[PDB]
């Protein structure tokens, strides 16, 4: 999980 900033 490398989710970008929203």
């Amino acid at each position, epitope marked *: 999980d490398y*989710e*970008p*900033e*929203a």
Partner: nanobody
Amino acid sequence: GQLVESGGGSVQAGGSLRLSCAASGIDSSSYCMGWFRQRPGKEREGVARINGLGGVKTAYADSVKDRFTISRDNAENTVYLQMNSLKPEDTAIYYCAAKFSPGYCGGSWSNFGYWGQGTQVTVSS
């Protein structure tokens, strides 16, 4: 694609209100979902947004940071706005919205495509 807000009402300064946004047609767990508001006599502005693709990261307008929390319950296909520490300045019609396609928000309020009819939030002193 339809979004329906509820949970609005008329509360007192310092209090809280929890708004809900029920999605239909689309699967909100997949989409960048947002809350916007239109304060009396002002243009619509972003309030909070949460990533799609099952993401959990969020962003907020400076005016509401630390007071409001957006979240999504994927099992209910519903997005929430938990509004704490309400101020009369938060009085507005609040709208739920989604970007056009599954994905991440990309750091902006642009390109929101589906919109609810809105729910009134009044905060009095």
